[PDB]
Scaffold this active site. Sequence first.
Site, PDB file in Angstrom:
ATOM      1  N   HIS A  61      24.873  54.404  17.153  1.00 46.68           N
ATOM      2  CA  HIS A  61      24.715  52.970  16.983  1.00 46.68           C
ATOM      3  C   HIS A  61      25.449  52.462  15.734  1.00 46.68           C
ATOM      4  O   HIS A  61      26.038  51.359  15.846  1.00 46.68           O
ATOM      5  CB  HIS A  61      23.252  52.437  17.041  1.00 46.68           C
ATOM      6  CG  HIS A  61      22.174  53.354  16.476  1.00 46.68           C
ATOM      7  ND1 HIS A  61      21.478  53.118  15.294  1.00 46.68           N
ATOM      8  CD2 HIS A  61      21.623  54.466  17.002  1.00 46.68           C
ATOM      9  CE1 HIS A  61      20.540  54.027  15.154  1.00 46.68           C
ATOM     10  NE2 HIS A  61      20.667  54.897  16.133  1.00 46.68           N
ATOM     11  N   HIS A  91      23.617  52.047   5.859  1.00 47.43           N
ATOM     12  CA  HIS A  91      24.467  51.873   7.006  1.00 47.43           C
ATOM     13  C   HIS A  91      24.877  50.407   7.084  1.00 47.43           C
ATOM     14  O   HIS A  91      24.372  49.582   6.299  1.00 47.43           O
ATOM     15  CB  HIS A  91      23.745  52.288   8.311  1.00 47.43           C
ATOM     16  CG  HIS A  91      22.514  51.461   8.550  1.00 47.43           C
ATOM     17  ND1 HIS A  91      21.288  51.748   8.016  1.00 47.43           N
ATOM     18  CD2 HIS A  91      22.348  50.285   9.175  1.00 47.43           C
ATOM     19  CE1 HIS A  91      20.427  50.792   8.334  1.00 47.43           C
ATOM     20  NE2 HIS A  91      21.049  49.876   9.040  1.00 47.43           N
ATOM     21  N   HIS A  93      26.118  46.971   9.856  1.00 42.83           N
ATOM     22  CA  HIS A  93      26.261  46.305  11.130  1.00 42.83           C
ATOM     23  C   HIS A  93      27.503  45.420  11.004  1.00 42.83           C
ATOM     24  O   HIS A  93      27.721  44.814   9.963  1.00 42.83           O
ATOM     25  CB  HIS A  93      25.035  45.457  11.473  1.00 42.83           C
ATOM     26  CG  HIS A  93      23.759  46.195  11.389  1.00 42.83           C
ATOM     27  ND1 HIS A  93      23.163  46.775  12.475  1.00 42.83           N
ATOM     28  CD2 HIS A  93      22.967  46.556  10.343  1.00 42.83           C
ATOM     29  CE1 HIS A  93      22.078  47.426  12.122  1.00 42.83           C
ATOM     30  NE2 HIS A  93      21.933  47.298  10.811  1.00 42.83           N
ATOM     31  N   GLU A 103      23.477  40.501  10.648  1.00 38.53           N
ATOM     32  CA  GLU A 103      22.191  40.384  11.339  1.00 38.53           C
ATOM     33  C   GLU A 103      21.455  39.156  10.796  1.00 38.53           C
ATOM     34  O   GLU A 103      21.146  38.222  11.521  1.00 38.53           O
ATOM     35  CB  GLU A 103      21.413  41.672  11.163  1.00 38.53           C
ATOM     36  CG  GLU A 103      22.133  42.833  11.827  1.00 38.53           C
ATOM     37  CD  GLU A 103      21.222  43.935  12.270  1.00 38.53           C
ATOM     38  OE1 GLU A 103      20.444  44.442  11.404  1.00 38.53           O
ATOM     39  OE2 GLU A 103      21.275  44.327  13.441  1.00 38.53           O
ATOM     40  N   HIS A 116      22.888  47.650   4.859  1.00 39.56           N
ATOM     41  CA  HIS A 116      21.460  47.910   4.686  1.00 39.56           C
ATOM     42  C   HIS A 116      21.273  49.186   3.914  1.00 39.56           C
ATOM     43  O   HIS A 116      21.628  50.264   4.387  1.00 39.56           O
ATOM     44  CB  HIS A 116      20.775  48.036   6.038  1.00 39.56           C
ATOM     45  CG  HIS A 116      20.709  46.742   6.753  1.00 39.56           C
ATOM     46  ND1 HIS A 116      20.504  46.621   8.133  1.00 39.56           N
ATOM     47  CD2 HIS A 116      20.836  45.480   6.274  1.00 39.56           C
ATOM     48  CE1 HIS A 116      20.514  45.337   8.439  1.00 39.56           C
ATOM     49  NE2 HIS A 116      20.702  44.639   7.331  1.00 39.56           N
ATOM     50  N   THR A 195      15.663  46.638  12.331  1.00 42.21           N
ATOM     51  CA  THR A 195      16.433  45.828  13.242  1.00 42.21           C
ATOM     52  C   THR A 195      16.958  46.615  14.432  1.00 42.21           C
ATOM     53  O   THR A 195      17.650  46.031  15.274  1.00 42.21           O
ATOM     54  CB  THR A 195      17.566  45.072  12.571  1.00 42.21           C
ATOM     55  OG1 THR A 195      18.587  46.009  12.219  1.00 42.21           O
ATOM     56  CG2 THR A 195      17.095  44.271  11.387  1.00 42.21           C
TER      57      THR A 195
HETATM   58 ZN   LIG Z   1      20.453  48.033   9.600  1.00 39.95          ZN
END
Ligand SMILES: [Zn+2]
Length: 257
Positions: A61, A91, A93, A103, A116, A195
């Site tokens: 992911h 990590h 996004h 996010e 994050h 999330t």
């Molecule tokens: Zn995250």
Amino acid sequence: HWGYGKHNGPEHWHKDFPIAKGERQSPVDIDTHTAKYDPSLKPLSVSYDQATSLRILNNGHAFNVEFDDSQDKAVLKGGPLDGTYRLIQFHFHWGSLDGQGSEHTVDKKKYAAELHLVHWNTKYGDFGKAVQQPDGLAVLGIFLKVGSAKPGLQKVVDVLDSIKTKGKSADFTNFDPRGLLPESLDYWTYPGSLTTPPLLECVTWIVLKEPISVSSEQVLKFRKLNFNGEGEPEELMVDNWRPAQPLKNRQIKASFK
Ligand SMILES: [Zn+2]
């Protein structure tokens, strides 16, 4: 089999993870016209001088940069927090296009990406116990915009070729996460969730006001990662973000005027 595709993306997650429709889901839109300054919020204390990065992993992911969290080496304290929270991993996004990827949003604005830094409350002894508690985790979220390069991100970017596909890992020692922080530690904070599945409502979110800048070349390298395993059909790891969720009965507080 959750992911970010047409058939398994965020709108589907609630069938396996009914908390997806819960009362404290993340991310949220941060309305800067309704968040209220809380003068009793304390400065954040980010103590990363003894951090020990270990490894970088493509989990299908995102990718996680993992740390030794068996001692108080890289900790977050202060701010809204009581107690000591240990850094376990960070990590990101990100989007397929520079106009999406974050996010959290700010006044509905989407950034190109979001970092994050995930920390767990040492009173609960390990990460797995911490995620079962409403005050188990503290996540520091940092927005990324495209502009100038971020020198402190380049070591991450340069290893991505080695972890192109799901399940690949590589040694990743001596990485200093202080190189990913903006100048200011002014922040918004609210109670929310992971999330990604399992979407547990265990997070005190601390979202920094000031974004960092990364270059077009740096974000382009993120977009060459793959969701799939080696020898599976190539699907670019892009748009691995959950959209904003209803705020419900929550207030976002600001550390700054
Ligand atoms: Zn995250």
